[PDB]
Design a protein around this ligand. Structure first.
Ligand code: BCL
Ligand code: BCL
Ligand code: BCL
Ligand code: BCL
Ligand SMILES: COC(C)(C)C/C=C/C(C)=C/C=C/C(C=O)=C/C=C/C(C)=C/C=C/C=C(C)/C=C/C=C(\C)CC/C=C(C)/C=C/C=C(\C)C(=O)O
Ligand SMILES: COC(C)(C)C/C=C/C(C)=C/C=C/C(C=O)=C/C=C/C(C)=C/C=C/C=C(C)/C=C/C=C(\C)CC/C=C(C)/C=C/C=C(\C)C(=O)O
Ligand SMILES: COC(C)(C)C/C=C/C(C)=C/C=C/C(C=O)=C/C=C/C(C)=C/C=C/C=C(C)/C=C/C=C(\C)CC/C=C(C)/C=C/C=C(\C)C(=O)O
Ligand SMILES: COC(C)(C)C/C=C/C(C)=C/C=C/C(C=O)=C/C=C/C(C)=C/C=C/C=C(C)/C=C/C=C(\C)CC/C=C(C)/C=C/C=C(\C)C(=O)O
Ligand SMILES: COC(C)(C)C/C=C/C(C)=C/C=C/C(C=O)=C/C=C/C(C)=C/C=C/C=C(C)/C=C/C=C(\C)CC/C=C(C)/C=C/C=C(\C)C(=O)O
Ligand SMILES: COC(C)(C)C/C=C/C(C)=C/C=C/C(C=O)=C/C=C/C(C)=C/C=C/C=C(C)/C=C/C=C(\C)CC/C=C(C)/C=C/C=C(\C)C(=O)O
Ligand SMILES: COC(C)(C)C/C=C/C(C)=C/C=C/C(C=O)=C/C=C/C(C)=C/C=C/C=C(C)/C=C/C=C(\C)CC/C=C(C)/C=C/C=C(\C)C(=O)O
Ligand SMILES: COC(C)(C)C/C=C/C(C)=C/C=C/C(C=O)=C/C=C/C(C)=C/C=C/C=C(C)/C=C/C=C(\C)CC/C=C(C)/C=C/C=C(\C)C(=O)O
Lengths: 56, 38, 60, 179, 48, 40, 49, 38, 34, 59, 49, 39, 57, 38, 49, 39, 53, 36, 49, 39, 57, 38
């Protein structure tokens, strides 16, 4: 359990984890912004019934 | 460095962080009244 | 076939060759100053450091 | 603690501060590598870098100033000595070192040609040598040689490292931010 | 039966139980909201 | 390594009675929800 | 029969098992939902009002 | 881990397994009377 | 010891995931993606 | 509160301020690009006149 | 015949048996679901009524 | 690793465990045949 | 299992496998997002019958 | 890295690997009911 | 006779024999499925209702 | 590897399992012949 | 046997070769008309595209 | 060699086990969509 | 004429003869299937009954 | 490699193994001739 | 005759032939895949009579 | 690097090469029955 920190130092793992989480969060937020259904800056105030849906 | 100065610094850092969050909360509430995004 | 064509196949063969070449050159780059020193101990990136290379000098 | 330098603070990645005088102890830009303690040899098993007085077949090309007997102006704009002999590379014919006799003589020091600049970039009157790396006082602490006719790779590194380390350690101003 | 906790951190056990309980209760409350139609029918009553 | 045999015996007591109290409370919540909207 | 647990951490076995059980119970519950159609029929009874 | 503590652990394991299996049997019995799957 | 950092790393990690789970609950109420 | 032993407060402050400045500039620039929140041009409009983005109708 | 087990860890024997048995049991359950038409027919009973 | 003495004792447990799996699976196939024969 | 961690450095294997799984997961996710049938950000609310299918021949 | 450390690590690595597969198995079953690919 | 096994590994022999039997039994079962048409015809009886 | 005494014992067990596998397979072909006989 | 090739080098080379080959085959099938399983995997064998005679 | 022969046991079993699993994968793909 | 085998590893001859016979029987079997028309004619009966 | 005695004992087994293989193949060809003769 | 291995290093030679064989196998497979008659990924289910044939002159 | 070494290598090298050729012969015969090229 805790012995993973005797193998990976806490400082390096924390910096990599923070960096990966920030990049992932920005990528997902930007992917949603580019979509029609989840461009919340633009549609945003539309109800779930009014929101765009992809073609069947 | 010393824990005496590690206690002084953490007090201002938390209060500065708290002050920054609160003014951002006020700013977001102002923008919501003007033009809500949901 | 239809989507797969010769240019694409040649491009991917070149990509594999380039990646192998980059691995070889990165191995050659680690012949001086290795292994790295860290508080946690010795460190080597990928690719690992190669074997010790010895030169040959003219006799006196 | 065999490198004579101490970390600034306890945070890792911090820079080292030299304990003594970094020019002589060989720290930072004054560091030298532990090369072989044997002279470099040409293709015919002869010393690669030798003074001209050991080989009279070498001369100075016409239209090139003879730097022997010329003053050596250091970073203080004060003469630190006079050039008296040239050390040349026999493998590839080129001036490698200048031998400088100090103002009060009593000793001779070497000066790599890479730190020598000529006035007006060598276009107008060439009446002195410019050494921007070291001060006239530190010319006396340049490491010496074991022999007066050959120089090994170990000492070759030491002389070059000593001069190159003086772009950061000649004066306190050279190791400080400009703004 | 009590020996399974031997050598373990009590705060880690309570942290992992709070994670389980909070994550599980959030899934089932969403499960239950759609089954019962809980907030929808009453929200539509007042927001008429 | 934390929580020796004596600590693990005492912790197991509070953890067991904590589970029982939580389950009993959830039993009432399910009983109240069943009379409101039974799900079967 | 009891010697299989020799040289094994009891914490690891309970972690490996209880997490095998959690994943299998989730798969079979989803399997059982589509077979019985339980949430569908009862949800539709409350969504028609 | 050792020989002697794997004898008692296996006893705790077996009783926990049967109690889990028996309680699941009651669940399947109640589900069969409600919606048999065959 | 590594035990001290493990307690803070686990509690910080599980707290982060729970707060993210609430964010997904709020987004589901606003605009479901399934 | 022990985070300042493992990290230099001087360097964390600079990293934090730099990150907040980049994030704030990016969000302001994204909103300036959007049609609904291009406040320099249409900030005087009311919420009833503010642009709302929609997808094309079926017919 | 019992001397085949000599030399190898009994954990590896059982660890490699579960992979075989779990892998095989999932293939044949999929094989049997399509052959018998279960739970296709029972699922269609509860969806239609 | 494994020795001769503990290999016969393990083999005895392995055979009875293997065998019990067979009758347990045998009833399952018998119960499945009465429900939906596959031939 | 017996001598796999003695001949291969577990720290090097840990980092190599974590980096490989991250790249593979992103590649599969991006391939599905680029497809018509599994562009779940746009059409995730469609049922299985209404989802796009490739043309048959 | 001796044989003793290679055993305690292996137990945690196998358990972590098996847990990764189980969650992936649940996710694949969840995605199959939503939109099967065969 | 028995001397053919001399100098060998019992586990290598059983590993390669199981590989032989598993690989051959796969080939002939697909061979037999297409010849008899067994799973197809019984699947059609149950998946027509 | 295995010694000559070890190989003599292995070969007898390997032969025993070979016919046991073959006899059990012979019953499988007999059962399949009555069901759907080939050629 | 494994005294002339250093099994450590072989395993890393073999894993890399298998991973590259598996990706190449999977991607070639994905680019084809008949085996673009992401889009048309729900079609039956009779419905799947076939190249012209 | 004792160490080489012990490694050969795991490598040969691993190679053969890998190929059998791949053979099962091709069997499942053949039922879904045969290529011949 | 036992002098041929002198100096060659017996496992090599048996494993090299196994490769020959296995590959030869596979080729002749496919050769024989097309000549006799088996199992084409028998498969037609069961798959078109 | 082998010795004189090793090659002599091996050769006798390899001949009866070869001869036994021909007899069973002869029966198979004889059985196949009555079913579907190829000339 | 095995003395050929005393004139060429077995380790170097067998690596070269494994590499050359792999390149040749990939080249032949890819040439067939690009052809009309043997594009087996698409037309592998066609019988020999239905397979494409080059123009006859 | 010796005369004895070539004895052990040749047996496995010849058997491996012969096995490769035989399996390629089976593959070419299989491809001929499927779609002959002459
Ligand atoms: C259509 C998409 C939705 C939406 C859906 C979601 C969803 C769903 C989620 C977020 C999440 C977040 N969103 Mg978003 N989001 C929208 C629009 C926005 C806008 C905007 C300009 O409109 C902004 C600024 C944000 C901003 C944010 C971040 C605050 C957060 C991701 C940070 C992160 O992962 O750091 C990673 C990198 C780091 C360095 C971490 C930094 C520290 C983090 C913030 C907290 C650490 C733990 C904390 C201290 C608790 C400790 C433990 C205790 C025991 C409790 N969103 C729109 C409307 N957003 C995620 C989240 O986590 O929310 C809580 C999330 O799951
Ligand atoms: C139309 C032709 C006739 C026929 C006429 C004959 C005649 C005539 C003879 C035989 C003979 C044999 N026949 Mg018949 N035979 C027919 C149909 C069959 C079928 C079948 C189910 O269709 C089978 C299993 C057999 C089996 C056999 C063998 C027992 C025997 C050859 C032994 C030998 O040398 O093997 C070679 C050894 C091997 C090990 C071959 C192994 C083949 C496999 C494919 C090798 C690879 C396995 C690997 C693990 C698989 C990997 C899976 C993945 C692909 C990775 N026949 C039909 C009805 N058969 C011969 C004999 O000796 O009879 C006594 C003979 O003379
Ligand atoms: C059309 C496609 C589907 C879909 C289908 C699938 C399927 C199918 C799967 C996923 C899986 C994943 N999906 Mg997806 N997914 C979709 C949409 C999303 C979206 C989104 C914005 O819409 C996101 C953010 C994700 C996110 C994710 C990840 C959580 C995960 C892959 C991570 C990984 O392997 O990292 C690389 C790995 C690491 C970095 C290492 C992680 C180690 C973990 C944290 C710890 C394990 C060990 C620990 C000790 C275990 C203890 C427990 C007990 C021992 C049991 N999905 C859409 C709707 N998704 C995959 C998965 O792996 O699930 C588990 C998976 O199988
Ligand atoms: C229209 C063309 C046909 C077809 C016609 C053929 C023909 C004809 C042959 C192959 C051969 C092969 N084909 Mg092709 N093939 C087709 C489609 C495929 C597909 C696919 C995705 O559809 C795949 C993955 C393959 C794959 C393969 C390989 C298994 C093999 C080449 C091995 C190699 O690299 O040797 C080169 C490798 C080296 C020089 C170094 C590595 C050597 C090792 C030992 C190779 C091991 C492979 C195998 C087990 C060999 C036996 C080795 C002994 C047991 C020691 N084919 C289509 C349907 N293919 C060839 C072969 O040898 O088959 C056995 C062959 O003769
Ligand atoms: C569509 O839009 C996209 C963009 C795509 C979606 C967005 C997505 C994302 C990923 C958003 C990310 C958000 C985020 C991440 O976590 C947000 C995180 C924000 C955070 C943590 C803010 C914290 C701020 C803290 C501050 C300001 C502290 C100030 C402290 C002060 C002033 C005191 C200093 C003075 C001192 C100490 C003196 C004492 C000295 C002493 C005593 C001495 O010397 O002794
Ligand atoms: C969509 O529908 C789907 C999801 C498919 C349907 C769902 C299906 C499934 C399968 C659901 C699963 C349910 C489940 C699984 O079993 C649910 C399992 C629930 C369980 C077990 C809950 C347990 C709760 C336990 C509690 C609250 C204990 C609290 C203890 C307390 C407070 C004491 C604290 C300790 C102290 C004070 C000691 C201090 C230390 C001391 C003194 C020391 O050390 O000295
Ligand atoms: C879509 O179709 C699909 C659905 C896929 C078709 C499905 C098909 C299949 C094939 C499904 C398979 C199901 C299956 C496989 O067999 C299912 C197998 C299930 C099994 C075996 C469950 C076993 C559970 C065991 C339990 C709960 C044991 C608990 C033990 C406890 C609590 C005691 C803990 C011990 C302690 C505390 C000791 C402390 C003292 C110590 C340490 C000391 O004293 O020292
Ligand atoms: C659909 O189309 C296609 C796919 C083509 C169709 C074709 C399908 C085919 C060909 C299928 C083949 C199936 C097959 C092949 O024979 C299947 C073979 C199955 C077999 C053999 C199963 C055997 C299971 C045995 C079990 C479960 C035994 C467990 C033992 C236990 C629990 C006790 C352990 C005790 C211990 C450990 C004590 C240690 C003591 C110690 C340490 C001590 O005392 O010290
Ligand atoms: C498409 O149609 C095409 C394909 C074209 C048609 C063609 C088909 C063809 C040609 C088929 C060929 C088939 C064939 C022949 O050639 C098939 C050959 C089959 C054979 C031989 C099967 C043999 C099986 C043997 C078994 C199961 C033995 C198991 C033994 C056991 C369990 C005991 C192990 C020993 C122990 C435990 C002692 C330890 C002692 C120790 C350790 C000690 O002492 O140290
Ligand atoms: C478009 O179509 C195109 C593509 C063009 C068509 C063309 C196709 C072509 C040309 C294909 C070629 C295919 C091919 C041949 O070339 C393919 C060759 C495949 C092969 C051989 C695969 C072999 C894999 C072996 C594996 C995975 C082994 C794993 C081993 C394990 C797990 C054991 C390790 C355990 C250890 C070490 C610990 C114990 C040690 C201990 C205890 C100790 O040491 O002490
Ligand atoms: C399209 O159709 C086309 C293709 C065109 C038409 C084809 C035409 C042609 C030309 C076909 C060719 C056929 C042919 C070639 O001539 C066929 C040749 C066949 C031959 C030779 C078969 C030989 C088989 C031999 C066997 C089975 C021996 C087995 C031995 C055993 C079991 C004993 C092993 C045990 C031992 C030894 C004990 C060890 C003791 C030890 C070690 C000790 O004590 O030391
Ligand atoms: C594009 O093609 C167009 C243009 C269309 C036309 C083409 C035209 C042309 C020009 C085709 C050319 C074909 C050709 C020739 O040039 C083809 C040449 C093929 C050849 C020769 C293949 C040979 C393969 C041999 C192999 C695979 C051997 C493997 C050996 C193994 C496995 C043994 C391993 C032993 C071990 C490990 C024991 C170690 C012992 C030790 C160490 C000990 O004892 O110490």
């Amino acid at each position: 359990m805790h012995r993973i920190w005797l193998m990976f130092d806490p400082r390096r793992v924390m910096v990599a984890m923070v960096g990966f989480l920030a990049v992932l969060a920005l990528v997902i937020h930007f992917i949603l912004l580019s979509s029609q259904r989840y461009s919340w800056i633009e549609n945003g105030t539309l109800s779930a019934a009014q929101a765009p849906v992809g073609a069947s | 460095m010393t824990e005496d100065e590690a206690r002084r610094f953490h007090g201002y850092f938390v209060t500065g962080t708290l002050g920054y969050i609160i003014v951002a909360a006020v700013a977001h509430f102002l923008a919501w009244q003007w033009r809500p995004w949901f | 076939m239809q989507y797969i064509d010769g240019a694409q196949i040649a491009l991917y063969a070149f990509w594999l060759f380039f990646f192998g070449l980059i691995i070889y050159i990165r191995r050659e780059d680690k012949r001086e100053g290795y292994p790295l020193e860290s508080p946690q101990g010795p460190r080597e990136g990928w690719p690992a450091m190669p074997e010790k290379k010895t030169y040959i000098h003219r006799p006196t | 603690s065999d490198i004579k330098a101490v970390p600034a603070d306890s945070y890792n990645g911090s820079a080292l501060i030299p304990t003594g005088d970094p020019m002589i102890d060989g720290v930072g830009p004054s560091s030298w590598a532990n090369r072989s303690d044997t002279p470099d040899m040409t293709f015919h098993n002869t010393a690669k870098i030798v003074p001209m007085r050991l080989d009279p077949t070498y001369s100075i090309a016409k239209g090139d100033p003879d730097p022997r007997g010329l003053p050596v102006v250091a970073a203080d704009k004060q003469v630190a000595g006079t050039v008296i002999e040239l050390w040349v590379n026999r493998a590839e014919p080129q001036v490698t070192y200048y031998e400088v006799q100090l103002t009060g003589s009593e000793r001779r020091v070497m000066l790599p040609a890479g730190f020598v600049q000529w006035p007006n970039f060598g276009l107008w009157g060439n009446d002195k040598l410019l050494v921007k790396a070291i001060t006239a006082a530190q010319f006396a602490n340049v490491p010496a040689l074991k022999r007066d006719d050959q120089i090994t790779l170990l000492e070759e590194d030491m002389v070059c490292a000593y001069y190159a380390g003086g772009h950061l350690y000649a004066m306190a101003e050279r190791s400080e931010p400009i703004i | 039966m009590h020996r399974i906790w031997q050598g373990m951190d009590p705060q880690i056990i309570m942290s992992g139980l709070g994670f389980f309980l909070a994550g599980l209760a959030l899934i089932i409350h969403m499960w239950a909201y759609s089954i019962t139609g809980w907030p929808k029918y009453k929200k539509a009553q007042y927001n008429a």
